[PDB]
Design a protein around this nucleic acid. Structure first.
Ligand code: NI
Ligand code: NI
Ligand code: NI
Ligand code: NI
Ligand code: NI
Ligand code: NI
Ligand code: NI
Ligand code: NI
Ligand code: NI
Ligand code: NI
Ligand code: NI
Ligand code: NI
Lengths: 137, 137, 145, 145
DNA sequence: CCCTGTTAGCACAGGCTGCCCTAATTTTAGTGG
DNA sequence: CACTAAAATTAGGGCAGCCTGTGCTAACAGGGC
């Protein structure tokens, strides 16, 4: 359903920072409609796997490793949204729902093909900036 | 890694019908590169859920329900292939692999849009036909 | 350590009714020594599961189902208490605490058999009446004037 | 359901030593009707708490600490079995089941009273030896050749 | 040997509920001003 | 009302202990070049 739990967690956190709200496990429990214990356990794993940390104040902070992955996903997300509006012609309202699944399967090759095809876009079809276009190459 | 195990088993069984090769479990192990025990388990799970059934000769055959579903995943896989070649301009030797993943996240909404935008396609860029177009709408 | 939280909440509520005190989430807090937030949360599950209802004036009331269980656990508890004292010879100061755990594991089969071997007791050795002997299936009520 | 998971695991492994059957997580899954992943996760927990170790060949081996506790539970189990047969008269088919729950709530105080009241039983009504009475402190090991 | 499969025993990811906590805050009830 | 003590909630956790899906090797079974 999430298609890829880990990435959804990484991207959910990114969203939170973007939204200005403090990233805590409760914020994720709500947004992904999953039990409290599920988020703790999924986050533990991501911690175990050097993707993030739970600070002393229980703040969620991404590691360099994790922030790299998170960016990659948001980048695909927003490239997806673009592709869906400019080219495919999917109605405004459903573009996000669709991209939420696509972000998890697009390769970086297609990403780079989209940059060309879509005319060096720098923003989602909503004003939202596209992260890490530089590292994409 | 398959993204969707079930759907991949379905499309694989479909491919085997298309190619006219005898549909055995050993056949799914080779292509999906899993172990005999692994594919037997998963198959009997799909049997449990009424997607397929093992005959007397151990022939895996799709149910009514299971056939429909497969057609739909093949429809996606190949429309994805069209889009990746005709529009995105992804190199040829990589379009399948990419669409192997995209097939599992595409919405029918996106499918109907592809039909229009791709100018009523009937085949993947590789040649093979695209099924389920009528069922689509 | 409670062994069964739910049965203990019910039995607690029943002790309180026996004793005369109004049954509030806050009494359970003090009896079972648990945090307020915990006691409210546990009570929601029991409300969810149809064991009790929290009334408009915050009173805790047992449902037919809840009351049934309450008695069945009390009955188990004072039977165990009889056994331990009259048969097993455990020192008094431990027999309640023991019964507090045994109450959560004893079946109705054992209970019935206990009634016969203890020569039809009607009270725990502390004197407190054994409830639910009728619904258990081993006695009928016959009034004396 | 099991009343206390850990103790049931310990006791089940101890059971498997008695019958001389190889102590694998798979056995536990079967006997307690639980999924493999459940027992695996729970066994890690008990490893982590010094109750047992998982050998290189996956054999489950009780640590001294886990063993003491397991004997202590097995002892309660069978003491309770004697009590249910000799004294209470619970039907045979229901006795182990009842004991399977009693084993988890009986104090050692009760175990010692039961040794007296049951005239120093050495065996459960099923024929199986009651282990750990020396540790209980009611007897002394003396060897016969 | 090979092909194809089963049976027995694992791995880990990724879901869940029950039941316990502090802290901080808020709400409900009654005394007294 | 005002003010407070008891009562309860909000907010964010903890840990134990359940589950199914989907992946693996080993060991073997039986049919066959
Ligand atoms: Ni911080
Ligand atoms: Ni979006
Ligand atoms: Ni997503
Ligand atoms: Ni056939
Ligand atoms: Ni293809
Ligand atoms: Ni695929
Ligand atoms: Ni009332
Ligand atoms: Ni008592
Ligand atoms: Ni109790
Ligand atoms: Ni060994
Ligand atoms: Ni037994
Ligand atoms: Ni037990």
């Amino acid at each position: 359903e999430l298609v890829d739990t880990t990435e959804m967690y990484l991207r959910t956190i990114y969203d939170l920072e973007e939204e200005g709200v403090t990233p805590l496990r409760a914020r994720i429990a709500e947004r992904l409609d999953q039990s409290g214990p599920t988020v703790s356990q999924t986050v533990s794993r991501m911690e175990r796997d050097g993707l993030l940390r739970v600070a002393g104040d229980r703040h969620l902070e991404l590691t360099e490793k994790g922030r790299a992955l998170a960016i990659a996903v948001m980048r695909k997300h927003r490239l997806a949204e673009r592709l869906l509006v400019d080219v495919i012609g999917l109605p405004w309202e459903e573009v996000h729902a669709e991209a939420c699944r696509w972000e998890h399967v697009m390769s970086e090759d297609v990403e780079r093909r989209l940059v060309k095809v879509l005319n060096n876009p720098t923003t989602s079809p909503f004003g939202n900036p596209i992260p890490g276009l530089v590292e994409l190459g």
